Design a protein around this ligand. Structure first.
Ligand SMILES: C[C@H](CCCC(C)(C)O)[C@H]1CC[C@H]2[C@@H]3CC=C4C[C@@H](O)CC[C@]4(C)[C@H]3CC[C@]12C
Ligand SMILES: C[C@H](CCCC(C)(C)O)[C@H]1CC[C@H]2[C@@H]3CC=C4C[C@@H](O)CC[C@]4(C)[C@H]3CC[C@]12C
Lengths: 200, 195
């Protein structure tokens, strides 16, 4: 059985998105067939094995350290930090990069929506000392007590860079890949808890 | 293992197919990246050297008695098709420990400038209620970023007669194909990185 939060049932809701000029929507209104509180617990709850599965579902993510729970707790103002290594295409860049991820709970209301903001640094990529990646993961109620996910991203430039265009695009396209894995791994965790594995 | 098959063009901007999802359809895997040009991946799965597809099938530990795979006839083009068979061992089964799988593949669309659509129709006679359905699985291949290939697989059950196990079969099929598609992707990524 999958973790639950209250309320377990709710009418569809809308996140309070503050889109900016530099922001691109990666995926929008992506449905996940389980109540909001369940999905929030899968990605962000105290059993961090599910988030661990989300990251290692991408073959290119390696050396994933253990994911801590959110402290002080899973609530607005909570945060956590972890790292892993992402293999890249070495013809357009370096063969891999460390990824230093900070997640901050910006808003958490299971009656309405959840906003977890990822701030990520990639020290090994060209111009990696000039920017951080901001990724906003919104979770909200979809139809029939399901969950919709929307992900928005931008580059926070802390210094000027000659790679500005390549980094913003690579970041968007790379995150289409990673969010598609996250959505698929979440859908798999839900469908595996509900049914018997018919092979293997 | 030394050189991979090619088709032209070898380079192209990203494309996306009309996956035409309906209410009875389920996504198996979507937008899975394969780091090789579209014509290369198409040749690996469907080209006349069928050794690569044979390797894809036998990479799945649940597949046994994998016969030689024929090429598409009349040839690899829209309207071409092929037929092959193997046996899939089952896990938490309600019936037998394994089932024969009778596969027909049809090329519904093939344009290396755009996308390729191969539809698999599979019959599993030995499973409970197996005389009431065939499995339809659509494999879409299209251009991803940087001259790579994206794959999307969508599946539904074609019920030819009434069935009371309808719910479990539709779910068992999605779950089993998630497994087999992940094995296919890992073998394809294996073949490309070894080249
Ligand atoms: C900065 C580089 C692009 C560099 C372009 C260059 C220098 C090779 O031309 C991009 C490409 C891949 C991006 C990662 C993809 C996915 C994620 C997961 C998400 O949860 C957190 C952000 C992260 C790690 C992206 C960071 C920026 C990356 C490395
Ligand atoms: C019909 C059964 C599920 C129902 C079994 C029941 C009712 C006993 O639980 C499913 C489970 C495994 C499914 C196969 C998984 C893999 C593939 C490969 C794909 O390329 C072609 C379809 C096929 C053979 C699935 C057929 C349906 C199967 C046997």
């Amino acid at each position: 059985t999958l973790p639950k939060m209250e309320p377990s049932s709710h009418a569809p809701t809308e996140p309070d998105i503050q889109k900016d000029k530099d922001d691109s929507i990666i995926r929008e209104n992506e449905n996940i067939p389980a109540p909001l509180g369940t999905v929030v617990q899968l990605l962000f709850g105290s059993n961090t094995e599910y988030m661990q599965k989300v990251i290692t579902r991408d073959k290119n993510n390696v050396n994933v350290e253990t994911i801590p729970k959110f402290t002080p707790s899973l609530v607005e103002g909570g945060s956590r930090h972890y790292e892993y290594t992402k293999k890249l295409n070495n013809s357009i860049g370096p063969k891999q990069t460390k990824c230093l991820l900070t997640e901050s709970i910006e808003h958490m209301d299971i009656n309405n929506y959840v906003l977890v903001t990822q701030t990520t640094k990639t020290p090994d990529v060209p111009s990696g000392s000039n920017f951080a990646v901001e990724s906003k993961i919104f979770l909200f109620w979809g139809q029939h007590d399901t969950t919709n996910m929307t992900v928005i991203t931008k580059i926070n430039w802390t210094s000027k860079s000659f790679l500005k265009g390549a980094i913003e695009k690579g970041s968007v396209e790379g995150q289409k890949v990673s969010v598609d894995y996250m959505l698929s791994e979440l859908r798999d965790i839900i469908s595996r808890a509900k049914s018997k594995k018919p092979v293997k």
